[PDB]
C-alpha cells in the first residue's frame, strides 16, 4: 500500500455518506424521490466492514454518519428496510469501543429500533442483540 490510501479512502467515504444524506433529506423535504441511501448502501457497507479501514473510519467519526443514515427521514418515515438491515449488520461487525458509542450517539437510534413497535420483527431483534452486545462491552 501507499501509506496515505487508508485515510484517503476513509475520508472520502465520510464525505460521500454526508453528501448522500443531505441530498436524500432535501429530496424528501421537497416531496421528490430520495433513493441515494437505497442505491449506495450495499457498496458503502462493503467499505464500512473493511478491517483495514476500521480504526481510521472510527477515528474520523463515521458512526455519526451511520447514525444519520438510520435516523427518521424528514417526513418522519424510516429509511428503507435494506438500509436498516445492512447498517445494523455493519454495526455488529465493527469493533466499537464505548467512548465512540458515547460521542456518536449511535446507541440512541439503535435503542429506538429495538423498542419500535412498528419495526419488523427481524430488525427489532437485530437491534436488541446490538444493545445487549454493546451493554456487555460498556460494563
Amino acid at each position: 500500500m501507499d501509506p496515505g490510501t487508508v485515510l484517503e479512502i476513509s475520508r472520502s467515504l465520510k464525505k460521500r455518506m454526508q453528501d448522500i444524506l443531505k441530498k436524500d433529506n432535501a429530496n424528501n423535504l421537497e416531496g421528490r424521490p430520495a433513493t441515494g441511501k437505497i442505491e449506495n448502501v450495499e457498496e458503502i457497507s462493503d467499505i464500512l466492514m473493511s478491517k483495514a479501514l476500521q480504526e481510521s473510519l472510527l477515528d474520523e467519526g463515521i458512526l455519526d454518519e451511520i447514525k444519520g443514515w438510520l435516523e427518521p427521514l424528514p417526513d418522519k418515515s424510516m429509511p428503507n428496510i435494506k438500509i436498516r438491515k445492512r447498517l445494523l449488520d455493519v454495526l455488529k461487525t465493527m469493533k466499537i469501543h464505548k467512548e465512540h458509542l458515547v460521542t456518536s450517539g449511535v446507541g440512541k437510534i439503535v435503542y429506538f429500533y429495538s423498542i419500535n413497535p412498528k419495526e419488523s420483527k427481524e430488525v427489532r431483534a437485530s437491534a436488541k442483540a446490538l444493545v445487549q452486545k454493546w451493554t456487555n462491552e460498556v460494563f
Binding site: 427518521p72 418522519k76 424510516m78 458509542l101 450517539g105 437510534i109 435503542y111
Partner: peptide, 15 residues
C-alpha cells in the same frame, strides 16, 4: 446506560 442509549424518548415522535 442512558448516556449510550438515551431514555428512549429521542425518536418517539415517529410513532
Amino acid at each position: 446506560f442512558f448516556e449510550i442509549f438515551g431514555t428512549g424518548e429521542e425518536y418517539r415522535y415517529v410513532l
